[PDB]
Design a protein around this ligand. Structure first.
Ligand SMILES: NC(=O)c1ccc[n+]([C@@H]2O[C@H](COP(=O)([O-])OP(=O)(O)OC[C@H]3O[C@@H](n4cnc5c(N)ncnc54)[C@H](OP(=O)(O)O)[C@@H]3O)[C@@H](O)[C@H]2O)c1
Ligand SMILES: Nc1nc(=O)c2nc(CNc3ccc(C(=O)N[C@@H](CCC(=O)O)C(=O)O)cc3)cnc2[nH]1
Ligand SMILES: [Mn+2]
Ligand SMILES: [Mn+2]
Length: 159
């Protein structure tokens, strides 16, 4: 089973200049909660952005080129990335925009944070079809001294 996890600002912006232009500790904690002890698939730019392995997860990087760090696994296709996960209950696809586009059609589940922030972007989450997803969990948080925006954690299942 393949899931996508992402945080989306207004207009589905997910990134700018190979970074995420917000700072929400509670959302990173949610990300860690939902990915720990699961393989995480990411594109090379997202690998470069994160800048180091995500511990406690098998990190699988997509690139057409040979790999450049044996602390993670490198693969050259969607099919190869899936296979490299092995027999696991749930594969987490952790972006970025290009990778989300390719895994969206296979995904059974989306873990989306909706962040109340307007930000310029150069990368978006896919413009997916709302009707085809059932919201099964939704949890809103107001901003606080640690988190400058309000945000909502949503889980969607493919209908
Ligand atoms: N807000 C969020 O939840 C979130 C999550 C993740 C990332 N981001 C942000 O998104 C941005 C990065 O996204 P992006 O769309 O620019 O890049 P990306 O999807 O992370 O990486 C794209 C790259 O992955 C490789 N790739 C992808 N599909 C492949 C395939 N089928 N076969 C082989 N290689 C493949 C290619 O590497 P090669 O060029 O080496 O072939 C490609 O150029 C950053 O701003 C980042 O901070 C945000
Ligand atoms: N909901 C969500 N939020 C994100 O920030 C997010 N980020 C990515 C990709 N980028 C990143 C960037 C940093 C870390 C990170 O440093 N996480 C650590 C620390 C977690 C924490 O501080 O609580 C981790 O161990 O997961 C993870 C993913 C993909 N999906 C997401 N999904
Ligand atoms: Mn805001
Ligand atoms: Mn919804």
């Amino acid at each position: 089973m393949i899931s996508l996890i992402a945080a989306l600002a207004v207009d589905r912006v997910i990134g700018m200049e190979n970074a995420m232009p917000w700072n929400l500790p509670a959302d990173l904690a949610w990300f860690k909660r939902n990915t720990l002890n699961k393989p995480v698939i990411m594109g090379r730019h997202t690998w470069e952005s994160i800048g180091r392995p995500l511990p406690g997860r098998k990190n699988i990087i997509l690139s057409s080129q040979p790999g450049t760090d044996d602390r993670v696994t490198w693969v050259k296709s969607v099919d190869e990335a899936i296979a490299a996960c092995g027999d696991v209950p749930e594969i987490m696809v952790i972006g970025g925009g290009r990778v989300y586009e390719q895994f969206l059609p296979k995904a059974q589940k989306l873990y989306l944070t909706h962040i109340d922030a307007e930000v310029e972007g150069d990368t978006h989450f896919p413009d997916y079809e709302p009707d085809d997803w059932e919201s099964v969990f939704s949890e809103f948080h107001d901003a606080d001294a640690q988190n400058s925006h309000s945000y909502c954690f949503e889980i969607l299942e493919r209908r």
